[PDB]
RNA sequence: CCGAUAACGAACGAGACUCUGGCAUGCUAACUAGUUACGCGACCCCCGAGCGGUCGGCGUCCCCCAACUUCUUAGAGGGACAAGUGGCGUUCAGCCACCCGAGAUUGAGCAAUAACAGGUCUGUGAUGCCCUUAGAUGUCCGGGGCUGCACGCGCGCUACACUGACUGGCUCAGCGUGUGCCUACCCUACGCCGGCAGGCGCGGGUAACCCGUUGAACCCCAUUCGUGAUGGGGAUCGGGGAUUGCAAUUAUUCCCCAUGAACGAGGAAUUCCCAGUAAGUGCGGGUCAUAAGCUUGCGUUGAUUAAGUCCCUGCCCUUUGUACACACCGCC
């Protein structure tokens, strides 16, 4: 156990989904590539944790509304 | 006081031969790498020297 | 569980008993035969290798910790 | 050839002034003498030029007398001086080895002359304490109580 | 008078019990008669799907 | 075919109870040439079952300090022990190993915490993983003390421990202890 | 039958024990540190060294010439590094010069026997802390 | 070089110099707005630049 | 069917070589062979009085496997555990005199020589007989 | 964190972060790391292997006289994210199982608001106040002492044995140190003498260049022992010899021959611990003129049991009571 995302990654993911919904997609690697340039994240570890949550929310939003 | 016995006893070696270069104490002295430093003094001056506790 | 007084060497009663009964049962080890015959066990090592040189038993393992022999195959 | 015990066997036999076992190996059995260890036993039987795989009860009479003269006169048979007990002795300055109660007599001699000269070591001996400078605050209480 | 020993197949693990987690309630149906299922309190690591021995039949499992 | 220790095929062995059939790793896909593989079988739950049982035997042999890492010694111990049993019984030593574990498996136990105020020892059943783990541990601890102060070798004393357990002659340490565990479970059922 | 420059070099390590196997075209033989696999120090694990050559038989070893240099670790770690080095070296040489279709039909047997024959163990060791004799063991504490 | 000292001892000696220099400058320019110091060492020369608030003092 | 010393069992090779040294009356031995122990950490002198032939066989192949090895290299190789009694055990190097005597005795037998640097290395005649005994011990062992 | 929700949005701490471990036959390169190829050899051969086998033998930056970074070093990057699948779950946060993968929880470092009259004036030319200050509690020298033992306690090491001890043989590491302002003190190869501790002369090294391919122990292979307080144990003690020091007695240490004490798995109790972990087993550093049973690291061999709970012990939150607020060591 212990795979809970922090509010830092959670909030940042919701922002970038709202501001760039079109450019994102269902692929994690594509998401971490677009997140590489649109936002300035210093850490790669933080970078792909954000993209991991974004790919998780992309599946949710394609089949139902979410909080964002 | 008289010259013959004021420094008659040698200290070429042992714990009294060595002292801290900041405070002249003779306990907990680090001699590695030519440091010659009282250990509490070394913990004080480590950052200026260049020692970093990476982990 | 008081004492063992294991025999350092053979005598009239044991030497013949070893030569007549040892190559008959399945497990022939210095430990087993020393328990059965109350012999020392350093004697058991010397006796078993002499029995092996006499052709009455066949070697199985030949290890430093334990050497194991067995009876000949009947035929 | 790994046969029975011989007729000329001693199950218990007397060497010097005390008894030594027979069922044990020759070198490891003669060490029962008060003054011979396993090194001394091996090096005198090697100079005695006899077997080492046979027990003490296999020691025929001429072997018995052979090895006792060796162990009583070691230096005369090219045993090195540094192998000995009483090397460069305090009485005669003569190398020798002490055996049986002869060890006990030389041991007693040192102890009584140490008390006689009133050295610190002898005083500790007399008081039943340690002599080699080891501490006594925590250990050794079994020897007193 | 002694009941025959048989086997029981684990369906699901109810949880832990015994005030230390040492025991484990489990729902088991006999393979002789798969209709009947009882709760038995096992000792040791049990997964779901594996089967286990039973020296008796009537005795169920209470708490602890 | 696989020939553990150069012989003793694992294709003709069977497990009589389905309780332990699904927890013994003597089968073909779990048949190893030697009882030595640092396969990380204790990293998570329910991995030790898929580890070969002979590997478990050598694991449970190294005990009590003086040999806690000497896997090479336990391998030659079970090697000579397999030879000894194969000599004096003739059948498959892996088969007699499986049978010995089956017999020594304690099918019931006590929880000892049945009642809070006063110790009650509620009688309970035993999971299969506990069945094998206790059975192998009883066999290895029986072998440990069967030759503590005697001439008998560790390989031989382990061998007769296995034989008596596999034949259910009740003179084995495992059979005595298992029976005792059953008796108390009957007593406080 | 005369094709030169047909060689690979594949390493393999476990617990700071690297073992580089050099593979090339040649008649079927095997040597580690200049001596055959049979003449090795832990002969109780000698079955594990010949275990890879027993899986796919000597026929897939008869057309190859492989020699291994080993450094580091202990006896067990060297042996394990060597046997995985052999499997990795043969499988890579086969993949390099002939079809991977037949490379698969030996790779599948290798992994389904023992994945460590092709995949190195990631575990090395844990550092010692200043609170006890070892990595996690702590010194005795006493209250009275 | 045998007349020379090991590089490890050299860096230690440098940090010893920097630490002592910093402490002496601190105790000397404590009232003069002392802030810090740096050294650039070259085979030709070694330079000491003292950073302070009131350089005219 | 050529055989190198590396291609036989070293346990059987060493005893074969020492028996050859026993037969060949050329190898000189000192007169203290029945007296001293082989190292500082040894509690007892070796059980074989032919230990000198055994050791000379050992150091023969040791200089075969790698050259440039001197006395301190030899005492390092033959060093072992020392119980230290109540103290925890340590590593004690072998005795210098026993290794020196072996090196100078093989020197006298003239199948080893001083290098351009320190240590000693085999002569061509040296490994000639070593590969000669390794082949014959291989042929006897294999059949 | 998700969720109900008079709250919404934040900030510290956790996280994030730095270092470290595993993977990249991807890039960058190396005579202070090397690897394949080749030329000489040396030996094995020759039954015939001959594109034969071994070489830590010599050379191919001896610079024109081969390539390359797989192995080593270390930079820049990548790589893992619960990402894919299935199941459970409010179907949310997540949990579990599996394929593929080097890795599906690597270890540390740092670390909140505050409190403990917690420990340190004997770390300091950090320090207030008091004491002493020439018959000195300043300071130096000499000797003794910090070790001293009717006893109790703690941390440990050595063992109680045959899963072993001894004898011999085979035999694989990784941390990391190494010649000094004061400061006279380094790691050491080889050769010779000595049984050993050691001694003598040449060397090398301020170091990926030398020690050093760190030929470590354990373990492995053979012989002996044989259940005997025994060849376990090496305590105690006698004699002798070397190293260091101005000095070895109250034994500095080390070496050899002696004697061989309790101890046969330890009561009530009690400590530490979940994967390269425990545990065995050595080796470095710090201490050092002399030196580790200590400590801190490193490596080797390497498991049993569990993926849970509040029963015990502690700790935290909520509720509750208060005559406490110097806050229960309280008030009275
Ligand atoms: Mg953090
Ligand atoms: Mg003695």
UniProtKB/Swiss-Prot annotation, chain A:
<feature type="modified residue" description="N6-succinyllysine">
    <location>
        <position position="19"/>
    </location>
</feature>
<dbReference type="GO" id="GO:0022626">
    <property type="term" value="C:cytosolic ribosome"/>
</dbReference>
<dbReference type="GO" id="GO:0005840">
    <property type="term" value="C:ribosome"/>
</dbReference>
<keyword id="KW-0689">Ribosomal protein</keyword>
<keyword id="KW-1017">Isopeptide bond</keyword>
<protein>
    <recommendedName>
        <fullName>Small ribosomal subunit protein eS17</fullName>
    </recommendedName>
</protein>
<dbReference type="GO" id="GO:0034101">
    <property type="term" value="P:erythrocyte homeostasis"/>
</dbReference>
<comment type="function">
    <text>Component of the small ribosomal subunit. The ribosome is a large ribonucleoprotein complex responsible for the synthesis of proteins in the cell. Part of the small subunit (SSU) processome, first precursor of the small eukaryotic ribosomal subunit. During the assembly of the SSU processome in the nucleolus, many ribosome biogenesis factors, an RNA chaperone and ribosomal proteins associate with the nascent pre-rRNA and work in concert to generate RNA folding, modifications, rearrangements and cleavage as well as targeted degradation of pre-ribosomal RNA by the RNA exosome.</text>
</comment>
<dbReference type="GO" id="GO:0032040">
    <property type="term" value="C:small-subunit processome"/>
</dbReference>
<dbReference type="GO" id="GO:0005730">
    <property type="term" value="C:nucleolus"/>
</dbReference>
<comment type="subunit">
    <text>Component of the small ribosomal subunit. Part of the small subunit (SSU) processome, composed of more than 70 proteins and the RNA chaperone small nucleolar RNA (snoRNA) U3.</text>
</comment>
<keyword id="KW-0597">Phosphoprotein</keyword>
Curated annotation (Swiss-Prot), chain C:
<dbReference type="GO" id="GO:0005737">
    <property type="term" value="C:cytoplasm"/>
</dbReference>
<dbReference type="GO" id="GO:0005634">
    <property type="term" value="C:nucleus"/>
</dbReference>
<comment type="subunit">
    <text>Component of the small ribosomal subunit.</text>
</comment>
<dbReference type="GO" id="GO:0005840">
    <property type="term" value="C:ribosome"/>
</dbReference>
<dbReference type="GO" id="GO:0003735">
    <property type="term" value="F:structural constituent of ribosome"/>
</dbReference>
<keyword id="KW-0963">Cytoplasm</keyword>
<dbReference type="GO" id="GO:0022626">
    <property type="term" value="C:cytosolic ribosome"/>
</dbReference>
<dbReference type="GO" id="GO:0022627">
    <property type="term" value="C:cytosolic small ribosomal subunit"/>
</dbReference>
<keyword id="KW-0007">Acetylation</keyword>
<feature type="modified residue" description="N6-acetyllysine">
    <location>
        <position position="3"/>
    </location>
</feature>
<dbReference type="GO" id="GO:0042274">
    <property type="term" value="P:ribosomal small subunit biogenesis"/>
</dbReference>
<dbReference type="GO" id="GO:0005654">
    <property type="term" value="C:nucleoplasm"/>
</dbReference>
UniProtKB/Swiss-Prot annotation, chain E:
<feature type="modified residue" description="Phosphoserine">
    <location>
        <position position="37"/>
    </location>
</feature>
<dbReference type="InterPro" id="IPR000289">
    <property type="entry name" value="Ribosomal_eS28"/>
</dbReference>
<protein>
    <recommendedName>
        <fullName>Small ribosomal subunit protein eS28</fullName>
    </recommendedName>
</protein>
<comment type="function">
    <text>Component of the small ribosomal subunit. The ribosome is a large ribonucleoprotein complex responsible for the synthesis of proteins in the cell. Part of the small subunit (SSU) processome, first precursor of the small eukaryotic ribosomal subunit. During the assembly of the SSU processome in the nucleolus, many ribosome biogenesis factors, an RNA chaperone and ribosomal proteins associate with the nascent pre-rRNA and work in concert to generate RNA folding, modifications, rearrangements and cleavage as well as targeted degradation of pre-ribosomal RNA by the RNA exosome.</text>
</comment>
<dbReference type="GO" id="GO:0003723">
    <property type="term" value="F:RNA binding"/>
</dbReference>
<keyword id="KW-0689">Ribosomal protein</keyword>
<keyword id="KW-0256">Endoplasmic reticulum</keyword>
<dbReference type="GO" id="GO:0005829">
    <property type="term" value="C:cytosol"/>
</dbReference>
<dbReference type="GO" id="GO:0006412">
    <property type="term" value="P:translation"/>
</dbReference>
<dbReference type="GO" id="GO:0022627">
    <property type="term" value="C:cytosolic small ribosomal subunit"/>
</dbReference>
<dbReference type="InterPro" id="IPR028626">
    <property type="entry name" value="Ribosomal_eS28_CS"/>
</dbReference>
<dbReference type="GO" id="GO:0098556">
    <property type="term" value="C:cytoplasmic side of rough endoplasmic reticulum membrane"/>
</dbReference>
From Swiss-Prot, chain G:
<dbReference type="GO" id="GO:0005829">
    <property type="term" value="C:cytosol"/>
</dbReference>
<dbReference type="GO" id="GO:0005737">
    <property type="term" value="C:cytoplasm"/>
</dbReference>
<dbReference type="GO" id="GO:0042274">
    <property type="term" value="P:ribosomal small subunit biogenesis"/>
</dbReference>
<dbReference type="GO" id="GO:0045202">
    <property type="term" value="C:synapse"/>
</dbReference>
<dbReference type="InterPro" id="IPR020568">
    <property type="entry name" value="Ribosomal_Su5_D2-typ_SF"/>
</dbReference>
<feature type="modified residue" description="N6-acetyllysine">
    <location>
        <position position="58"/>
    </location>
</feature>
<dbReference type="GO" id="GO:0016020">
    <property type="term" value="C:membrane"/>
</dbReference>
<dbReference type="GO" id="GO:0006412">
    <property type="term" value="P:translation"/>
</dbReference>
<dbReference type="GO" id="GO:0005730">
    <property type="term" value="C:nucleolus"/>
</dbReference>
<dbReference type="GO" id="GO:0032040">
    <property type="term" value="C:small-subunit processome"/>
</dbReference>
<feature type="modified residue" description="Phosphoserine">
    <location>
        <position position="1"/>
    </location>
</feature>
<keyword id="KW-0597">Phosphoprotein</keyword>
């Amino acid at each position: 156990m212990g795979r809970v995302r922090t509010k830092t990654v959670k909030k940042a993911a919701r922002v970038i989904i709202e501001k760039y919904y079109t450019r994102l997609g269902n692929d994690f690697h594509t998401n971490k590539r677009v997140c590489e340039e649109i936002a300035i994240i210093p850490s790669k570890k933080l970078r792909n944790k954000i993209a991991g949550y974004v790919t998780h929310l992309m599946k949710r939003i394609q089949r139902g509304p979410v909080r964002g | 006081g008289h010259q013959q016995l004021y420094w008659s006893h040698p200290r070429k070696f042992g714990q009294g031969s060595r002292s801290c270069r900041v405070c002249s104490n003779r306990h907990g002295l680090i001699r590695k790498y030519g440091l010659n430093m009282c250990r509490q003094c070394f913990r004080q001056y480590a950052k200026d020297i260049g020692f970093i506790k990476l982990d | 569980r008081d004492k063992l007084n294991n025999l350092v060497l053979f005598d009239k009663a044991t030497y013949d008993k070893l030569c007549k009964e040892v190559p008959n049962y399945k497990l022939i080890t210095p430990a087993v035969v020393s328990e059965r015959l109350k012999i020392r066990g350093s004697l058991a090592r010397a006796a078993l290798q002499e029995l092996l040189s006499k052709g009455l038993i066949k070697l199985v393992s030949k290890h430093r910790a334990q050497v194991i022999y067995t009876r000949n195959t009947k035929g | 050839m790994s046969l029975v015990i011989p007729e000329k066997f001693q199950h218990i036999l007397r060497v010097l002034n005390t008894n030594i076992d027979g069922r044990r190996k020759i070198a490891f059995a003669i060490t029962a003498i008060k003054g011979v260890g396993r090194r001394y036993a091996h090096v005198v039987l090697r100079k005695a030029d006899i077997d080492l795989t046979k027990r003490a009860g296999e020691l025929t009479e001429d072997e018995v007398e052979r090895v006792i003269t060796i162990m009583q006169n070691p230096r005369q048979y090219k045993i090195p001086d540094w192998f000995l007990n009483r090397q460069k002795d305090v009485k005669d300055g003569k190398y020798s080895q002490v055996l049986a109660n002869g060890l006990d007599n030389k041991l007693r001699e040192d102890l009584e002359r140490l008390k006689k000269i009133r050295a610190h070591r002898g005083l500790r001996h007399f008081w039943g304490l340690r002599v080699r400078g080891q501490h006594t605050k925590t250990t050794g209480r079994r020897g007193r109580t | 008078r002694v009941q025959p020993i048989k086997l029981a197949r684990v369906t699901k693990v109810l949880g832990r019990t015994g005030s230390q987690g040492q025991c484990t309630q489990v729902r088991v149906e006999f393979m002789d008669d798969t209709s009947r299922s009882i709760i038995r309190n096992v000792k040791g690591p049990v997964r779901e799907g594996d089967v286990l021995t039973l020296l008796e039949s009537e005795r169920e499992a209470r708490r602890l | 075919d696989i020939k553990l220790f150069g012989k003793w095929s694992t294709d003709d062995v069977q497990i009589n109870d389905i309780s332990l059939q699904d927890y013994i790793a003597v089968k073909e896909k779990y048949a190893k040439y030697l009882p030595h593989s640092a396969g990380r079988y204790a990293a998570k739950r329910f991995r030790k079952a898929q580890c070969p049982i002979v590997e478990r035997l050598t694991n449970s042999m190294m005990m009590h300090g003086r040999n806690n890492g000497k896997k090479l010694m336990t391998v030659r111990i079970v090697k000579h022990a397999f030879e000894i049993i194969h000599l004096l019984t003739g059948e498959n030593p892996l088969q007699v190993l499986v049978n010995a574990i089956i017999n020594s498996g304690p099918r019931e136990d006590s929880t000892r915490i049945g009642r809070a105020g006063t110790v009650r020892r509620q009688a309970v059943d035993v999971s299969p993983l506990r069945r094998v783990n206790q059975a192998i541990w009883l066999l290895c601890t029986g072998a440990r003390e069967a030759a503590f102060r005697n001439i008998k070798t560790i390989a031989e004393c382990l061998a007769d421990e296995l034989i008596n357990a596999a034949k259910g002659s009740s003179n084995s340490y495992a059979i005595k202890k298992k029976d005792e565990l059953e008796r108390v479970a009957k007593s406080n059922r | 039958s005369k094709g030169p420059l047909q060689s690979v070099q594949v390493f393999g390590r476990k617990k700071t024990a690297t073992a580089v196997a050099h593979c090339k075209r040649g008649n079927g033989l095997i040597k580690v540190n200049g001596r055959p696999l049979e003449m090795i120090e832990p002969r109780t694990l000698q079955y594990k060294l010949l275990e890879p050559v027993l899986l796919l038989g000597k026929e897939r070893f008869a057309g190859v010439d492989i020699r291994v240099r080993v450094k580091g670790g202990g006896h067990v770690a060297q042996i394990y590094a060597i046997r995985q080095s052999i499997s990795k070296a043969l499988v890579a040489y086969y993949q390099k010069y002939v079809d991977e279709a037949s490379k698969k039909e030996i790779k599948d047997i290798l992994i389904q026997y023992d994945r460590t024959l092709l995949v190195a163990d990631p575990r090395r060791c844990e550092s010692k802390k200043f609170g006890g004799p070892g990595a996690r063991a702590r010194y005795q504490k006493s209250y009275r | 070089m045998a007349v020379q000292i090991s590089k490890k001892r050299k860096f230690v000696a440098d940090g010893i110099f920097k630490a002592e220099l910093n402490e002496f400058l601190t105790r000397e320019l404590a009232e003069d707005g002392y802030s810090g110091v740096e050294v650039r060492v070259t085979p030709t020369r070694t330079e000491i630049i003292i950073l302070a608030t009131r350089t005219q003092n | 069917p050529g055989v190198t010393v590396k291609d036989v069992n070293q346990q059987e090779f060493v005893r074969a070589l020492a028996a050859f040294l026993k037969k060949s009356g050329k190898l000189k031995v000192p007169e203290w062979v029945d007296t001293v122990k082989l190292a500082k950490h040894k509690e007892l002198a070796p059980y074989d009085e032919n230990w000198f032939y055994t050791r000379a066989a050992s150091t023969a192949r040791h200089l075969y496997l790698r050259g440039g090895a001197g006395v301190g290299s030899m005492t390092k190789i033959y060093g072992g555990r020392q119980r230290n009694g109540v103290m925890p055990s340590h590593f004690s190097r072998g005795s210098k005199s026993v290794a020196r005597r072996v090196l100078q005795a093989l020197e006298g037998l003239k199948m080893v020589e001083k290098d351009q640097d320190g240590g000693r290395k085999l002569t061509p005649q040296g490994q000639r007989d070593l590969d000669r005994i390794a082949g014959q011990v291989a042929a006897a062992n294999k059949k």
